[PDB]
Amino acid sequence: RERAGPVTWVMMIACVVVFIAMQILGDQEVMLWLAWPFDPTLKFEFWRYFTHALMHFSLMHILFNLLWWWYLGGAVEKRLGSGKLIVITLISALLSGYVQQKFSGPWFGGLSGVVYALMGYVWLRGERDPQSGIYLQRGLIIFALIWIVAGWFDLFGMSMANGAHIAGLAVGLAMAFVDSLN
Amino acid sequence: FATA
Ligand SMILES: CCCCCCCCCO[C@@H]1O[C@H](CO)[C@@H](O)[C@H](O)[C@H]1O
Ligand SMILES: CCCCCCCCCO[C@@H]1O[C@H](CO)[C@@H](O)[C@H](O)[C@H]1O
Ligand SMILES: [Cl-]
Secondary structure, eight states: OOOOOHHHHHHHHHHHHHHHHHHHSOHHHHHHHHSSOOSGGGTTOGGGGTGGGGOOSOHHHHHHHHHHIIIIIHHHHHHHOHHHHHHHHHHHHHHHHHHHHHHHOSOEEOSHHHHHHHHHHHHHHHHHOGGGSOOOOHHHHHHHHHHHHHHHTTOSSSOBOHHHHHHHHHHHHHHHHHHTOO | OEEO
16 A cells, blocks of 8 residues: 655655754755765765755755655655665766766755656656556656756746756666666 | 755
């Protein structure tokens, strides 16, 4: 009956805890603890290449990111196992974060590069390997596209980490090409 | 901050 596996569940708990902390302590204070290394002296605090994905600055995006995390990530963990979801998550957070700060610096956050990796991965893995038992529904492809399109044309009030989203998508596509050559 |  329960849809979310342990990894799916633990990532949602972490995001909520961080989000609470950003209300109590404020956004900037948490960014300093968790953002991508913003100084050379912090290049070995290894959590920071991943913990940027846990911070949200707006209610609307924590909602939608956790929604597709819960749905897509939940599907990957249930059909492909926990470790597989873990790997997609870590690599996508790493590389999306890399491409983002390269062209825009380190002050970004959100779990959406990981989400876009999951979209791409679920999708292409279903397209190229239907036996796997995962598939990106058409309704979702549309919702995803509109959301992306909104981000890229700035239809939210916010500043968007587009590099990280497109990077994220790319990673998930690549991983699914590899995985689907069995 | 920029969101992803
Ligand atoms: C505005 C863009 C259009 C949005 C439409 C998105 C359709 C989302 C489909 O997800 C559905 O979720 C349900 C459980 O959560 C299940 O019935 C089913 O397994 C799944 O297919
Ligand atoms: C498939 C689920 C439907 C999602 C419902 C939430 C829609 C997102 C709301 O966006 C907001 O809407 C206003 C009018 O569009 C803009 O003026 C505003 O700047 C923007 O922040
Ligand atoms: Cl956000």
